[PDB]
Every structure is written in structure tokens, then in C-alpha cells.
Amino acid sequence: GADGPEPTTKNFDPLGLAEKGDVLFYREAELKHCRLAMLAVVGMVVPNFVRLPGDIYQGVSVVEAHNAMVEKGPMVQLLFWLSLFEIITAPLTWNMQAKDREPGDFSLDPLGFCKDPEKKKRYQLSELKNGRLAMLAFSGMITQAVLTGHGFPY
């Protein structure tokens, strides 16, 4: 899917881990990390601009938000339902090369671009790329935010 674009990295597998077989699991893991990182970057930027109505949500920086919400509960109910979705998402664990479903695929395509194969390829590539950049951005955001006093620009 990645297919060899861009100057710095065309076919980046120096360690050649995928050469050990079962690349579909690695692809699904990459997609999962990408989705989490994109949502995490968005939730990193937004709280500075807007905070939820509840008083306990109000106040507290993104660096301390995790602990405060774990204490309050939101970071526990979120965990509960994420665990529901992950447990229900069993197929990926034991059947990887046997299952027909492509990695990181759920039957959610209201826009319908997945119907057209070529635009589907373009969109999968764009998703992978924006997700990789989002992973890097989230990592840098966290590190700089703890290193810096404030985390809105950082």
C-alpha cells in the first residue's frame, strides 16, 4: 500500500522486519497507531481553544489532563468502551493470512470513495502518510509540551 513515494524514504525497511513474514499484522498495527495519533493531535490542539462544559474538565493543562480525567472518570469510561471495541475486534489476533479482510478495514465508507478502486488507493496512501506525520507530531508535541512550560504552541 505504501508503494515507494517521496524522496527521503522510498521503500523504508532497513531492518527488513517485514521480510520475516506476516506483514498484514504490521500494517494493521501501523494503521491503528496512525488513527490514534491523528485523533491525539487533534485533541492536543483543541483543548487550548475549547474546553468541555463540566467544571471538572475546566482548567488543567494537556500534560496533566490524563491524570485528572483518570481520577474523574472520563479516562476510565473511555478505556472501558475502547476495551469493548478491541475485545470485539478479535479477528486480527489469530487469523491474519487466512482472513480475506484487508488490514485496518471496517465497513465504514459513507463517502463512498472506497467504491472507486483508484481513488481508494490514493486515499489509503494519504491516510498512511497523514497518520505517520501525525504520529511524529504527537510525539514531538508531548515531549516539547513537558519540556516547555506551556503546550499551546508546544
**Using the rule CB under 8 A, which residue among 70, 91, 120, 126 binds other proteins?**
91
* C-alpha separations of 106 from 110, 120, 129, 134 in Å: 12, 14, 19, 21
**Using the rule CB under 8 A, which residue among 10, 51, 66, 99 binds other proteins?**
99
| CB-nearer residue toward ligand CLA: 32 or 72 | 72
* Partner from ligand CLA, other proteins, none binding residue 81, C-beta < 5-8 Å depending on class: ligand CLA
Residues at the site binding ligand CLA, with contacts judged by CB under 6 A: 72-74, 77-78, 81
Instruction: Return the axis-axis angle of helices 23-49 and 62-72, rounded to nearest 10°.
Output: 100
* C-alpha separations of 110 from 36, 53, 102, 113, 139 in Å: 21, 30, 18, 8, 31
Least distance (Å) between residue 125 CB and ligand CLA: 28
In the chain, beta strands by DSSP E: none
Report the alpha-carbon distance of residue 13 to residue 124 in Å, rounded: 19
Residue nearest ligand CLA (C-beta atom): 73
Among the listed ranges 2-10, 69-77, 97-105, 124-132, the one in contact with other proteins (CB under 8 A) is 97-105
**Using the rule CB under 8 A, which residue among 6, 7, 17, 58 binds other proteins?**
17
Report the alpha-carbon distance of residue 45 to residue 151 in Å, rounded: 9
